[PDB]
Design a protein around this ligand. Sequence first.
Ligand SMILES: Nc1ncnc2c1ncn2[C@H]1C[C@H](O)[C@@H](COP(=O)(O)OP(=O)(O)OP(=O)(O)O)O1
Ligand SMILES: [Mg+2]
Ligand SMILES: [Mg+2]
Ligand SMILES: [Mn+2]
Length: 758
Amino acid sequence: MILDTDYITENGKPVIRVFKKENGEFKIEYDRTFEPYFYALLKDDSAIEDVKKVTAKRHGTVVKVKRAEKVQKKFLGRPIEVWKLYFNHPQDVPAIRDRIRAHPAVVDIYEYDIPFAKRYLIDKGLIPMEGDEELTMLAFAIATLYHEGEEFGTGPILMISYADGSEARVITWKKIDLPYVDVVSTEKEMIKRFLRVVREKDPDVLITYNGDNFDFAYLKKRCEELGIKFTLGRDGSEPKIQRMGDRFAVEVKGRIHFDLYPVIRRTINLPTYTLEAVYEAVFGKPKEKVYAEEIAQAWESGEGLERVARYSMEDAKVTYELGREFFPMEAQLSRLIGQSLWDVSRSSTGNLVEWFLLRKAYKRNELAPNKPDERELARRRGGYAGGYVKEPERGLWDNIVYLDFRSLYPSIIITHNVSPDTLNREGCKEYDVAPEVGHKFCKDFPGFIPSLLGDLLEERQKIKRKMKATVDPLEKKLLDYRQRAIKILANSFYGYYGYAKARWYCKECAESVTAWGREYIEMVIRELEEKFGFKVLYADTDGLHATIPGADAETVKKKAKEFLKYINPKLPGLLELEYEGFYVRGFFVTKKKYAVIDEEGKITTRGLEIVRRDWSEIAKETQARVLEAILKHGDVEEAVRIVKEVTEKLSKYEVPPEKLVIHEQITRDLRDYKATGPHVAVAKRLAARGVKIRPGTVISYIVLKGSGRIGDRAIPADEFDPTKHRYDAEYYIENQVLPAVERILKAFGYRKEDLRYQ
DNA sequence: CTGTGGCCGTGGTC
DNA sequence: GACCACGGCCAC
Ligand SMILES: Nc1ncnc2c1ncn2[C@H]1C[C@H](O)[C@@H](COP(=O)(O)OP(=O)(O)OP(=O)(O)O)O1
Ligand SMILES: [Mg+2]
Ligand SMILES: [Mg+2]
Ligand SMILES: [Mn+2]
C-alpha cells in the first residue's frame, strides 16, 4: 500500500521516494529514472531549435532544456501538437518556465506547475491507500502551562498524552498518583520519552486535533528551548512545517499525520469546534473541559492535578477514537482522488477536483489547460443564473410529501453530455440544446467530465445502501458523512465549471446545467399542480413539498407514488425523481426556512434560527420548543406560553450566561473589514490586546446593558461576570428571541406584543 | 477559494 | 425615519 511520495536531491539529481506499507512492513522505494517536464506549443516546429537554447540562471548555475520531443496529444478533445521539454531537476521548471513562455515562437506552455512528487504518482498510475494492508495509528495531545498575554510556547509542556487501540497514557514531570500517568524527572525527559514511545510503537498514522497549528509547533518550540532533536519521521527527520496560506500543515515523513480538525470542520456543523463539542456531536456523550487557569492553578500548588491528568488522557483517547472513525472516509477519498491522505484531508474541494481531473487527463492523453492568468481571471467575473426557489405557501399544512431529484446536476451533466470538449463542437451528428441559454452539446462521443461522474454516483449509491441497512447508529452516521462527502464532491464538479480559477472552466457548461435544472423542476411542479391535483407548497432547485388539500395521509402517499411511476419513464437518462419523505404536518416560514414533522414525531428543521451557529442558544432553544408545541402537539397556545416564560426569564436575569452567547466566525484579516459588526468589534479589541485572530477564529460574545451600537456593548464570552455587569435582557428579547419566534407565530395571528412580559 | 439563491441583523449614508 | 451595502451562514 502506497502512503506517500516525495523527492530528495542526491548529486544534483532528483530521486523519488515511494513510502509503502507491504505485508505489515514499512518500505522506502527509490526511483531515479523520472524526468521533470512540461509542454510547449509552438508556431512552427522549426522554432524548436531556438527554443531549446533558452536558459535561466538559478543560484549561479545555468539551467537548460535537457531534451525536447514532439508529442501528439488532445486538448479539449481536439488533436494538438506540442513539444515535451524535459529537465535535469524539478526546480529547473519554475526557473526557466517564464522565459520559455516569453520566447516569441511559443504560443503557450502547459503543465508547468505540477509538484514533482505528485507528477510521479499521476504519471506512474499509482493510487495511494489501495489494499487490505492494515495500518497502525497513534494519537497524541499536549497540556501546557498557560498565562494570558505571553508569547507562544513560553510556558513548558506539562503532559503529553497518547492513545492507540491498546492503552492511553500521560507522561508528566510532576507526581500524579494515577495508574495511566508516567512521572519522569523533567519536561525534557517527558518529551524524550514521548519520542521513544512513537519510535517503538512505530505508528503509520499520527492523529492530532489541530496538531497542524498548535501541538507540533509547541513541541518544536520546547525542543529548541530544551535542546532536543524532535525526531519523529521514519527517516530520522523532524516534522516538516509546510505552509498553506493563512494556516500551517505539518508532515511527518514516512507516517501519515492525520489532523482531524480540517476534516471535522468540513463535515460537522457546530457553533464552536472544541474537542468536547466535536466528541459530543459524534458520540453523543459529554467530555469534561478543564481550563488553562484550572490547569495552571493545579500545577503551581500541587493540588488537583489528577483532574488535569484525566483531562489530558481523555484528549488523546477521544482524538484516537475520532481518528479511527473518520479515517476510512479519508482513505476512500485518497483513493478516489489519487493523492495522499495527508493532502486530501487538508485539500479544498476545488483542488480535489483539479487533482482528480489531472490524473484522468493523463490516462486519456488530454493536455491539461492552465490555471488562468490575471487577465483571464478578470474576464471570468460574470455570474450566471442558479436554481429556481418557489416562494412557499405559508401556514400549517397536513400530509406533505417531499419529492426530490437524485444527484440532479451531476445527472444532467452526464445525460446531456455537458463538457467543454463537447460544447459547440465540430460538425456533430446529434446534440442536446440547453434551454434558455442555447448552448449545444455534442452527443456523438462522451465528454471528458461527463464520462467520469457516473462512477462517483455509483460509489455514493453503494455507500448509501450500506448506510440505510446499518442499524448501529454510530456507524450509520459515519456512513451518512461518507455518502454526503461523495455527493458534495460530485456536485463540486458542476461548481468547478463556474469556478474562476478552474483549469477546465466552462461558464456555458455551468449555466447550461442550472438551466436544465430549472426546466425539470418547473415541469414537475406544473405536472403536479395542473394534472395530478397536488398543491406544491414549497420547492427549491430540484425538490418540492406537496400535498393534496383535504386528502388523508394514505391518499397523498398513493397519489405521489403514482405520479413518480408516471413521470420517471418520461425522464431522459439518469434523471430520476425520488420519493424522499412524508410529513403529517409542516409549515413554511419563508424561502429556505421551514420545519416539518414525520410520522414518528421527528421534526426536521431547515434554515430557521434553530440550525444556525450565530444565534444565541436561548433564541434557538425557545424556537425549538415552539416548533415542538405546534408540530408535535398542535398546541399553539402552549407555544405562546413558552415564549412569554422565556421573555420573563430574560427580564429577571434568570437565563444563564451560556445561553446568551453568540458565535460568529472571523472570515478574513481584520484590516479587510469594510463594515465592523459586533463580532468584528470584539475581535479588533482582542487584536488590540495582543490576541491572535485569524480567519476561522470563532468569536464568542454577549451584549451587556446599554444602548448605541451593539458592538460597543459587546464583550468576549469568557469575560462576562454576572455580578459586576448585567446582560442586555432587552437585547435578547427584542433582537434574539422574539424575531426568531414571531416569524412563526405570526401565521397564527400573534404579534410581538402578545409574546413579551409586561 | 466548487457554484447560485436567499434570509437577516448591523450600522453606515442621507 | 428610509435606504441599503456588508457580512455571516444556511438550502440547494
Ligand atoms: N454543495 C453544493 N455545491 C454545489 N452545488 C450544490 C451543492 N449542494 C447542492 N447543489 C446543487 C447540485 C445538486 O444537484 C442540486 C440539488 O441539491 P441536492 O438535492 O441537495 O443534491 P443532489 O440532487 O445532487 O443529491 P440527492 O440525491 O441527495 O438529492 O443543487
Ligand atoms: Mg434527494
Ligand atoms: Mg434537493
Ligand atoms: Mn436532489
